[PDB]
Symmetry: D2
Subunit: 412 residues, 4 copies
C-alpha cells in the first residue's frame, strides 16, 4: 500500500462520506499521509465515540450535557440517563488539573490537564462496562447501559500557537475524546481593570487553529467532532488588525499594549461564526445572558449562509434563572434551542456547583448535628435507588465485585 494509494483512499472518503458534507480542509490528503508516520495506531474510544456523537447530534432532538470534573461524576451522568459528557476547562483549572493548583479560567494549568481528565472518565466508564458485563447482562437486556457516552472537551485556545493546538488535539484523541472545542480569545492576555475584558485574535489565527485541530484528527485517523467557539459577543478587544474580516468592527482606538478596540455583540459574533463555519462541525457563540431571541438571531444569521449547520449552546450557571425568567421559559428553554439548531447544549460548571454545594451542605450540618447530618444524605440516597442510583452499594460501584471475579479466576 503506497503513499499515493493511501492518499487516494483517504481523499475518496472525504468526498464520499456524508460525515464530511460541507467541510473544508485547507490541506490535501497527501499532506495527512506525509504526517502520519508509516503505521497508524488505533484509538478505539476516540473513533467509536466520535461516530456515536455524530449520530446522536444529527438524529436526536438535541443532546444536553453537564460539566464533569471526575470519572464518578461522568458515570453518575450516564446512570442518570444522559447521553454525552462535557469536560469544562474552567472546572479542571478550578479543581482538577495536573498541577494540583486552584486557578481561574486563564489557561494557567499545564496543557495536558484536560486530556488526563478525559482519560480518567473513560477509565471509569470502562470499569463500569466491565462490572456490568461481568455480571452477565448483555446488550438488549432490560436495564443495560451503554457506559461509553461521548466526551466533549474544552481545548481553550490551543495553549499557544498552531503546534500547541495540533498537539492538544492529539492528546485529546489519545485520551479518548469524542469532541473538542477551540475558542478564539487569548485568556492569557486578558486586560484587567475598567476598559478591559477578553481579547480576541484575528479570524486568520482562529481559523489556523481549527485547520490544525482537523489535521490532527485526520492524522490520528478519527472523525472527531470539531467545535468552534467564538467570544465575539462580549470581547471588545483584538490583538491585531491585519484580517479584513475583522476591520469592520474596529472602533479605531488602541490600548497601551497595542490592542485595537472593537464593537462587540451579535454582528462581530456572526462574522466569526461565518468564517469558522466551513472548517468546524458545530459553531458556538459563547453567551452569558441566556436569551432565545438572541439565539434565534444568531442561528438565522448562520443558517442564511450555511443551512442546517449544527450549533451548540452553553446555559450559564452564573445567571439567576428564577429572578429573570418564569418557570415556563426555564422549562422549555433547551427544547426551543433544540428546534433552532442547537443540537448540543450543556451547563459548563454543573460539576463544580454540585461538588461544592453537596459538601458544604453536609459539612455545615455535620459541624452542628454530627451523624444526623450524614443520615439526611443517606436517606436521600435510598430515596434515589428507584430512579437508578446504585452507588449506595459502594463496593460494587467501584468494582470490588469485578476484581473478586478476577482473583477467583486466577486462584482456582
Amino acid at each position: 500500500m503506497s503513499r499515493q494509494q493511501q492518499a487516494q483512499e483517504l481523499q475518496k472518503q472525504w468526498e464520499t462520506d456524508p460525515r464530511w458534507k460541507g467541510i473544508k480542509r485547507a490541506f490535501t490528503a497527501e499532506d495527512v499521509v506525509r504526517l502520519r508516520g508509516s503505521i497508524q495506531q488505533e484509538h478505539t474510544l476516540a473513533k467509536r465515540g466520535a461516530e456515536k456523537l455524530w449520530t446522536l447530534i444529527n438524529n436526536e432532538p438535541f443532546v444536553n450535557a453537564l460539566g464533569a470534573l471526575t470519572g464518578n461524576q461522568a458515570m453518575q451522568q450516564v446512570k442518570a440517563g444522559l447521553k454525552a459528557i462535557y469536560l469544562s476547562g474552567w472546572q479542571v483549572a478550578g479543581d482538577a488539573n495536573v498541577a494540583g493548583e486552584m486557578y481561574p479560567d486563564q489557561s494557567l494549568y499545564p496543557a495536558n490537564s484536560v486530556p488526563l481528565v478525559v482519560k480518567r472518565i473513560n477509565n471509569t466508564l470502562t470499569r463500569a462496562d466491565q462490572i456490568q458485563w461481568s455480571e452477565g447482562k448483555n446488550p438488549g437486556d432490560e436495564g443495560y447501559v451503554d457506559f461509553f457516552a461521548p466526551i466533549v472537551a474544552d481545548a481553550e485556545a490551543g495553549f499557544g500557537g498552531v503546534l500547541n493546538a495540533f498537539e492538544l488535539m492529539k492528546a485529546m484523541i489519545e485520551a479518548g475524546a469524542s469532541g473538542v472545542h477551540f475558542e478564539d480569545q487569548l485568556a492569557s492576555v486578558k486586560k484587567c481593570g475598567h476598559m478591559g475584558g477578553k481579547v480576541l485574535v484575528p479570524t486568520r489565527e482562529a481559523v489556523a487553529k481549527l485547520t490544525a485541530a482537523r489535521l490532527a484528527a485526520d492524522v490520528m485517523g478519527t472523525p472527531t467532532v470539531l467545535v468552534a467557539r467564538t467570544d465575539a459577543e462580549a470581547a471588545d478587544l483584538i490583538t491585531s488588525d491585519i484580517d479584513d474580516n475583522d476591520k469592520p468592527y474596529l472602533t479605531g482606538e488602541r490600548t497601551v499594549e497595542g490592542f485595537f478596540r472593537t464593537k462587540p455583540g451579535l454582528e462581530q459574533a456572526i462574522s466569526r461564526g461565518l468564517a469558522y463555519a466551513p472548517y468546524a462541525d458545530l459553531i458556538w457563540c459563547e453567551t452569558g445572558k441566556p436569551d432565545l431571541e438572541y439565539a434565534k438571531k444568531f442561528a438565522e444569521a448562520i443558517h442564511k449562509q450555511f443551512p442546517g449547520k449544527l450549533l451548540s449552546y452553553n446555559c450559564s450557571p452564573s445567571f439567576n434563572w428564577k429572578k429573570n425568567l418564569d418557570d415556563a421559559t426555564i422549562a422549555k428553554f433547551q427544547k426551543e434551542l433544540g428546534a433552532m439548531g442547537y443540537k448540543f447544549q450543556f451547563i459548563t460548571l454543573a460539576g463544580f456547583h454540585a461538588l461544592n454545594y453537596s459538601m458544604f451542605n453536609l459539612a455545615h450540618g455535620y459541624a452542628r448535628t454530627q451523624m444526623s447530618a450524614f443520615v439526611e444524605l443517606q436517606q436521600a440516597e435510598f430515596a434515589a435507588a428507584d430512579k437508578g442510583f446504585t452507588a449506595v452499594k459502594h463496593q460494587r460501584e467501584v468494582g470490588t465485585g469485578y476484581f473478586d471475579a478476577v482473583t477467583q479466576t486466577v486462584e482456582r
Copy 2:
C-alpha cells in the same frame, strides 16, 4: 553543631516535650541524625499542621472530619465550620488516584497517589488563604477563616515493607499532611470465598511499620500525628504465627495459601490495640458495625493499660443508621464517643456519597426536565449563602480576584 550535639538536643527533645509523653521509639536520636543528611529542609505546612492538630486533639471535646477527594471538597469543609480534613484511601482508589482508574480498596493504585491529593488540598487551602488575605481581611477580624486545617491521611499498610512505609510517610509530610495512619492488614492478599476476608500481619510487622512511620517523621523534622489502625475486630486470618502476641487467637487451622485462621472480635482487636499503643499517638479499631457498647469496652480496655491515650473512630457510611438506631442515640453518637476518648472521628467515604449523589440527582432531573433541575440546585445554593456558602460567586472562589490583583500589580 556536631552529630553528638545534634543527637543530644534531639534526645533532650524526646525527654522534655509533653508531646512525646508516653511514646516509645525503637531507635536512638543518633540514628535519626545519621539518616537526616547534612542539612534539614523545612516543611512549613506539615509542622504547623501537626502542632494545630495536636492541640485540637488534646483540648476540644473532640474533632470530627469528613472524607475529601478534591481541594474544593476540603475547602468547603473548612468554610462549613469543620476544623479538620480526612483523606480516604478508599475514595482515592475509587476516583482520585494518579493512575486515573476506578479501583476497590486493595492498594491497587500507585503509592504516591494519596500524597498527591494531600498536596492538592493544601494548594487549594493555600489559595483560599491568599484570596482572603488579598482582600484585606486580617486574623481576629469577623468571619476570618483559618484555611490551614490539618489533614489526616490514609497510608494503607505502607505499600510493601518497612521502606515503602518509611517513604510513604515522607511523601505525606512533604505534601503537608498533619496526620497519617497505617493499618495491620494486607488488602493485597484478601481472601475471596465463603472462608475468606481480610488478613492480618503479625503484631511484629505492624509495629515494624509504625517504627518506620515515626522514624520517617523524625528525619523530616515534623511532629506528625501517627495513628495505628487494627482490623482485628473482623479479620479472622493472619499470614503467620511467629509472634507470641498472636498465638492465643489462632484456631489451629490453615488455608490453602498458608494463612492461619484466627478468632476475630474485641479481644484480638484489644491485643493489637495494646501492642501498637506505645508507638502510635492515637489508636483506632476499625469497625463495620458502629456500637457504643463495643466502643466503651475497647476504650476501657486500652485505658487500663495506657490511661488518657487518644483514640479515633470511623463512622461507617454504608451502615444503615436509622434502621439500627433511634434519632436520639444517632444525634448524641459522636458526643458520647468524645467522653470515652475518641478525640478524632470521621466518615471515610463522605466525599464519595456527597459527590455521587448530587451529580446523579441533578443529572436525572436535567435528563427529564432540563434547566429547571439546575434551577432547583441554584436556589439551594442561594439559601446556603447565609450559612457561609460563597461558591455562588464562582469567579472569586477559584482565585480570579486574587490573580487580577497579580495582573494589576505587574501592569501599573
Copy 3:
C-alpha cells in the same frame, strides 16, 4: 457475537495458533470473555510488537538488548542496529521513576512508573518514524530504519498480590510493551545482616502471578511475551513452607521474621524453572556470576522436561569480565548462550553506566579545560556519522523538520 461464540473463537485460537504451543492457561476462554467487558479497545503497538518480538526470538540466533531509561537511549539503540529494547526496573528506581527519587532496587517507586517509561520510549520511537516517513523514505529503501523495536519490561514482583500484577500487566500493554517479566522474590522484605538476602515466595504464588499476567494479556487482546524469572539460585529464604514443590529445599530453620531458610543453587532454580515453564513463554534464572557451565546445566535441566523452551539470560554489568574471563571467551559468550537456547539476552543496567560515565567524564575535563573537553566529545560524535549516528543534526533528531512540516501544512 454472543458470549459462547466469542469463547468459541478464543478457545479455538489457543488450540490452532502455534504461538500458544506448550502454554497452559489455568482459566477458560469463557473467563477471559467474562472479564473483558462488552467492547475490546485496540492496542496496536502492544500487538504488532508482541508479534514481532515472538518472530525474532524464534527465528534469529539470539536477540540481545541493552537496558534503556529514556526514549533517546532507546532511539539510539535502534539506530545502532539492535532489534529489541530492555527496560530495567533498577534503572527506573535509580533515575527515571515518577516519584522523581533516586532509589535502590526494592520496588520502592510508584507502580505506574515503568509503564510511563515504556510509553515514553514508544512516543519517541513513534517520532523517529514520523520524521523518517515525513522525509519521503519508504520501507525497502536503502537506509530505512524500523523504529518500532519491541520492548521487554521489568514488572518486578508485581507490587503486591495477583491484582497488582494483573493491573501492571495491563499498564505494560497499554503503554505499548511487547514483553514483560515477573520475578519470584518479595524484594520489599529483603533481609539484612549476614544471615539474610533475597526472600522467595512459594511456587504457588509465583504461578498465581504468572496466570494473572496471562489473564490480563488475554483480556487486553494482545499476544504479549511473558517471561518468568527465578531468583532461586542465590535466594536462601522463603516466606512460607506450604507448597510441596519447595519443601525439598527447606533446612528446617526459621528467621526471626518467620521466613524459612533454604538451600540455594541450581537445584532450587530448576524446581522453579520447571514449575513456571508451563505458564510462561520464556524462563529466566537470574545470576550474579556469568558462567557458561551453569547456563548449560540449567538449559539442559529445563529442556529434558520442556524440549526447545525459549530461555533468557542477564549479563551482569557489575561482574569484572576482563579479570575473570579472557577476551575470546568474552567475545563468544552471547553466541554460546544462544546455541543453548537463551534467545533473549540483555545487560540490565547498560544505560545507567552509559549515562553516568559519559557525563562524569565530560564534566571532569570541562571543570579543568572548559570548552576543550566538549570538543573532544563533539569530535567523537563526528566520527560516529560514518556508522549511522545522526544526533549531531540535533534539530532534525528531535523533530524540528517534522513540525516545520506541520506548521507549513497549516499555514498557506
Copy 4:
C-alpha cells in the same frame, strides 16, 4: 507583625541589602505583602541555593555548567567538580518532559515539565548528601562533597502571559531552583519558510514578564537569581511596533501574519540588553556563532550604562569548534569570556550529546561484538575511579547503603 510592619521590613531589606543594588522593582513591598497570603511557606533549597549561586557568581573568575536532563547527570556533574547545574528547556522538550514526547524547542511540552526535572535533580542531590552523611563524613573532611549545587533553570518565555510566567517562577522556586531565565521571543509563533525565523515580543512585554518573575520570587520569599535572555541578535521579526525602544529597528516591512520585520544584530541586542538590565540579575544575549569579538562589544555596550553588570553566555553545542577555531582559542574561550563579565557560562545540550553518543557507541559495538563492547565501557569506568567516579559501585550510588541502614535501624 502587621501589614505595615511587614512591608517596612521588606522595604528596608530592598534598600539595605547589596544583593538588590541596581535592581528596579516596578512594585512595592505593600504589593508583595498583599499577595503573600497570611503565612509564608519556607523553601529551604531554593533560598540556600540562590544565596550560594549569588556568591559564586560575584566571586569566582566565572562559574560554568553543563545541561542536565536527569538527576544522575547532575550528580555526576557535581562529583566531577562543577559548581552549578544547568537545566535546558531544549533537553526537557527532547527527552524529559511530563507529556513523555520527543519535541523540538517551541514550548510544546506541558508548562510544569522543567520544575519537575528541577525537583528530580534536587531529590537525587538530597539523596547523595544522605548517603555521604550516613557514612560518617562531615563538612570539612578531605573530599566532603557539597552535593547541593545551585540549579539555573529554563523558563522559556513563561508559556503565555504575565500570570503564566508568575506561576512558572513559583513552580521553579518550589522545586528548589536557584536561578531562572526568561527569553523575549514568542517561540510558539515561529515564522516558517525562507522569510521567517524567531519572533521577538515588544520590550514592554518582555519586561512585564521579568517584573512578574521577580514578584514571584518575592512572594515565594527567596532571592532567586533572575536572568534575562534576548534573542534580538538573530531574530528579525517582532509581534508589534507599540514600543518606542523597538521602533528604531523596524524596516517598515510586514508579513502575512501582521508581524514587523526588524533589523537583527548587535544593536537590537543592546537595546534589549539595556532595557532588561534594571530588572535582571544577569543579562544573556543568546548567540548562534561563538565570537569573542562580539562578546566584547556587547559586554562593553552594557557596562557602558551598567558597569559591572553580571553577564551570561551559552556556548553553542552545534558549532563546529575545530573547523572554525584553533585549539588555543578553544582553550582560552571560557576564561576570556569571564574576564569580560560573563560570570555564568554553560553548554545547553551537553546532556543530550553525552547521553545519545554514549548509548549509540555502546549499542553499535554491542550489535557486532556483544559483550566485548560492554567491557570497553567497563574498563573506561575503572580508569575514572582515580578521578572521583563512584558509579561502578552501583548499589551504593543509588542508595542501597542508606536504605539498608534504615532497615537495620527499624529491625533491631
